[PDB]
Design a protein around this ligand. Sequence first.
Ligand SMILES: N=C(N)NCCC[C@H](NS(N)(=O)=O)C(=O)O
Ligand SMILES: [Zn+2]
Ligand SMILES: [Zn+2]
Length: 304
Amino acid sequence: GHSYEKYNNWETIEAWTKQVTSENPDLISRTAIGTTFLGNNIYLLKVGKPGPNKPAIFMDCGFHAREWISHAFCQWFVREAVLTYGYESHMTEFLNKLDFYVLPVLNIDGYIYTWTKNRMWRKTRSTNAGTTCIGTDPNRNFDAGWCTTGASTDPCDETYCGSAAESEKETKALADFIRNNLSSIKAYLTIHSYSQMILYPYSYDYKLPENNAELNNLAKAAVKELATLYGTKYTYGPGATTIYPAAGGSDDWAYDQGIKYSFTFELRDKGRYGFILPESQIQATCEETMLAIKYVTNYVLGHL
Ligand SMILES: N=C(N)NCCC[C@H](NS(N)(=O)=O)C(=O)O
Ligand SMILES: [Zn+2]
Ligand SMILES: [Zn+2]
């Protein structure tokens, strides 16, 4: 049984992608953008009412296997779209005018592994030459100052960059999709945990994007909007100085493709529970996060 207020295993999320699509044909379609190392279909939901020449926002969750609140959030976003479409003015406008691509779990193989073997797994589950150590950090595997700062060359390490940029089937699949849809995708949102942040480029070097002032102001406003609900405090800014320098991330890569609004979200908490955020916090976390995501969406829609 699927529930939006619990963490759902992959079999359940997969079945949910099929069911939520079938139940909402005028709002949702489903495709597979590729397969994981283990051969699992990487599902993508396109959320929006059909219309001509629609811009798009792309959002993924579940890069990192143990960040279960991320996976829960993508599901919550779709929950909100289907529940409130027609009833609530902003969500209705968003879905009438834009498409949202929601990739509920990128690193499916790692997610399954966190359910079956090791709750604290981070990386993919692919093999590495010359060692029995498993996996690549998908957020160190993009062509963005690849494998320099904040990324490890050691396959046994948690920030292993991989054998080459896009070596992983999952990150190749994501990069291919974004490249193939570059003319329509106006914003890229990538959901992680924890530490309560809205981050924008750059992380791969200490340098700033040309629209730094715009991104800074937008992140600042989205943080303030998030805080209105429960008082949850987020920090914000360029990744390198706001969290740490780290190369090969998808946010920086997407920005360097020309996607001008590119954000990494770090959801709750600030370390009390860390990755093992209790299910009792799913609702509040997702509801406040919705406010920030909708704020960014409204900004994008209003500044085309
Ligand atoms: N480093 C880039 N490009 N963006 C920020 C990503 C932050 C993210 N933090 S986490 N979820 O603790 O692993 C990461 O290090 O990949
Ligand atoms: Zn993460
Ligand atoms: Zn709600």
